[PDB]
Amino acid sequence: SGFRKMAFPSGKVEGCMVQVTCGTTTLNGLWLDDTVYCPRHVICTAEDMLNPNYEDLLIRKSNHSFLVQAGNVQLRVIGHSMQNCLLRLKVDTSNPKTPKYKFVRIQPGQTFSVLACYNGSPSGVYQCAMRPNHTIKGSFLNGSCGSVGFNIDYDCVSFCYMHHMELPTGVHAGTDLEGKFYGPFVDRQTAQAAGTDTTITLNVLAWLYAAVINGDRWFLNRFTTTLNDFNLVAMKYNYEPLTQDHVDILGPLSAQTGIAVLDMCAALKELLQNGMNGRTILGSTILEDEFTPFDVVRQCSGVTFQ
Amino acid sequence: SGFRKMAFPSGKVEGCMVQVTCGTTTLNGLWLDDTVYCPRHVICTAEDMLNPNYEDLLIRKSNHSFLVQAGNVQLRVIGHSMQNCLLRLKVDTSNPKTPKYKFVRIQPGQTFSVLACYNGSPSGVYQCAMRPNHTIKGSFLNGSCGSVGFNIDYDCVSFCYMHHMELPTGVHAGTDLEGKFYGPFVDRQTAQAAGTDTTITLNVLAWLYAAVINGDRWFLNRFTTTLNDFNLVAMKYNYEPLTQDHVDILGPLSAQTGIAVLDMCAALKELLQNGMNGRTILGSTILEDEFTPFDVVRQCSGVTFQ
Amino acid sequence: DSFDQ
Amino acid sequence: DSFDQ
Numbered sequence A, B: 001s002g003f004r005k006m007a008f009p010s011g012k013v014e015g016c017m018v019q020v021t022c023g024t025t026t027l028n029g030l031w032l033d034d035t036v037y038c039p040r041h042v043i044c045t046a047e048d049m050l051n052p053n054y055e056d057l058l059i060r061k062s063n064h065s066f067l068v069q070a071g072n073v074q075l076r077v078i079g080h081s082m083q084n085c086l087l088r089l090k091v092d093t094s095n096p097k098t099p100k101y102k103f104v105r106i107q108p109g110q111t112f113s114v115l116a117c118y119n120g121s122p123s124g125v126y127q128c129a130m131r132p133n134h135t136i137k138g139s140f141l142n143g144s145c146g147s148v149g150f151n152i153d154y155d156c157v158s159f160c161y162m163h164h165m166e167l168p169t170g171v172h173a174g175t176d177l178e179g180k181f182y183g184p185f186v187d188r189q190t191a192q193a194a195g196t197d198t199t200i201t202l203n204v205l206a207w208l209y210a211a212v213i214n215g216d217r218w219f220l221n222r223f224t225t226t227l228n229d230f231n232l233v234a235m236k237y238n239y240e241p242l243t244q245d246h247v248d249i250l251g252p253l254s255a256q257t258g259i260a261v262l263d264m265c266a267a268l269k270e271l272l273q274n275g276m277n278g279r280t281i282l283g284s285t286i287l288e289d290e291f292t293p294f295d296v297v298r299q300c301s302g303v304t305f306q
Numbered sequence C, D: 001d002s003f004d005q
Helices: A054-058 A201-213 A227-236 A244-249 A251-257 A261-274 A293-299 B054-058 B201-213 B227-236 B244-249 B251-257 B261-274 B293-299
Strands: A017-022 A025-032 A035-039 A066-070 A073-075 A077-083 A086-091 A101-103 A111-118 A121-129 A148-153 A156-166 A172-175 B017-022 B025-032 B035-039 B066-070 B073-075 B077-083 B086-091 B101-103 B111-118 B121-129 B148-153 B156-166 B172-175
Touching: A017 A035, A017 A121, A025 A066, A035 A156, A054 A077, A066 A077, A066 A086, A111 A156, A121 B293, A201 A244, A201 A251, A201 A261, A201 A293, A227 A261, A244 A251, A251 A261, A251 A293, A293 B121, B017 B035, B017 B121, B025 B066, B035 B156, B054 B077, B066 B077, B066 B086, B111 B156, B201 B244, B201 B251, B201 B261, B201 B293, B227 B261, B244 B251, B251 B261, B251 B293
Parallel strands: A101 A156, B101 B156
Antiparallel strands: A017 A025, A017 A066, A025 A035, A035 A086, A066 A073, A077 A086, A111 A121, A111 A148, A148 A156, A156 A172, B017 B025, B017 B066, B025 B035, B035 B086, B066 B073, B077 B086, B111 B121, B111 B148, B148 B156, B156 B172
16 A cells, blocks of 8 residues: 655666766766767856857867766767757767667656756656646756656666756756757747646546545545536646546556546546545645556556455 | 655665565565575465464574575575564675665654565665654555665665555554564554654754745744744644754754744744645645755755745 | 555 | 756
8 A cells, every 4th residue: 555756766777877077067968878968058158058059069069078977987979969959979988787778758747757966976866747838847956957857667768858957937847868858948048938837637537546546435426527527627727628538548447446537537526626625635635646547557556445 | 946755866775676485475685795684574474474483483494495586596595594573594695786885773754765676676766754653654565575765875875674564554664674673563463553643843844944945935924932832832733842952953954044943933833823825835735744854955955045 | 454565 | 037957
């Protein structure tokens, strides 16, 4: 029993963290085989960060403009190219700790683990969700740029995020491992703001199913709802429109608990209008949206506490 | 900016997880040098778990009653002894992945990271607090016994917890790495219940200081309080008595934010009586008690958002 | 009752 | 303004 924000074991990812210094800027890079990936803004000074032209800035650099350090040992750069918002630094060694891996761009609502890193040195791990507005509510200080987010399935690390910057609200922006930003955000210092966020309906529903799997059903009711009547309510409360795709994704969970999706929707509709009446669900006073249906299957019992 | 439940990078600990089977029970063990530590109840069948005598049960076992597997590779047992509630299995190999390390018994209120494990295979990492009633609100299924909790300072892993069992409330009990239980709990299946818990005052205060460090001060007021007047209120609300030791531990944080401890106590006193009035602190609708003062120093800026 | 896991 | 970290 129990239900917590659980991250993936971080070992396979720790073996790939290095430091990258260019001129006077130090940040973190990702060492896979004989390549090191990092944010391109490593090639910027303070002055440069407003209004940079990376083509022009990068062409003013050689292989030995870049310093990369794996633990104590210096790695020599022998090739460089730019790819969207990242740099790809070819090095003299292939990482002996390179795990099997993949580069995936994740979709809003999906979760991943983040290894927060400073000076190429791993300092903590946490779980979060890619928000609808393409930000993450992480925790980063200066020097965390190039810290990565990932999923582990079996033995294979799926890299989905690299950190680049922080926004005025205090939430975070970055890139997939092709160097393409999540969101309409850019690689420079201007007036940029997170767009308005929404609560992640599919995940709230997943988390309700977990509450039941773990033996709680106080919030259930006798009603049912149509998808469209649920949406009219979802909009009032700043929840995402629920779709048939989302209803199909909830099938296995509906089957394990014997509660129909649309019945759980009426459960939730009622939670939204009436409040939680001073009660908790899986130890929380609010509706939780940072667990996917997958996260619930992984973490919970396959056997319901009936 | 930002503030999250952050666990320690789990790599150094993953390299020490193995599987231990005895008869028909499989659980997780901890491989340091040429020793493997695990819960002694591995030597129990279903019948045995009520009313076991471990002396008598253990003497009916040889070295080869125990099977230990590190990844794919079988490790041979060549010695065994019991130590309080753990077994210590001497093996034929010394773990090449053994990090520098220590065994510490932690105190209530303190936090640590937990590597949840099944069949000697790491599946997730989360941060939690040792509660006043000596339980943890973790997340464990069957087969997680022998999963460990730890702190990492510099390069050195401080092991503080091994998992043994779950209680009727759904919270967890276990042991330090000397095999001595946290709490009045025992190694067998009887009517056992968590004693009544309390909220961890010192940590709530730490977390308030973080809210300020990160730039929030709405909850502050103009009042001050005496320690003893604060306690009269703490008792009503099921908070731990605050002590002078706790006030001294808060010194560095008081100094970085320029708010006196007892002034923050009046802040909190007021939060307890008046509620949060529909507002959040560091993104939360409730008072958070699972961050120590140390966790706040590690994670937050050394520089206040004034 | 409790449960040894 | 934003901040590249």
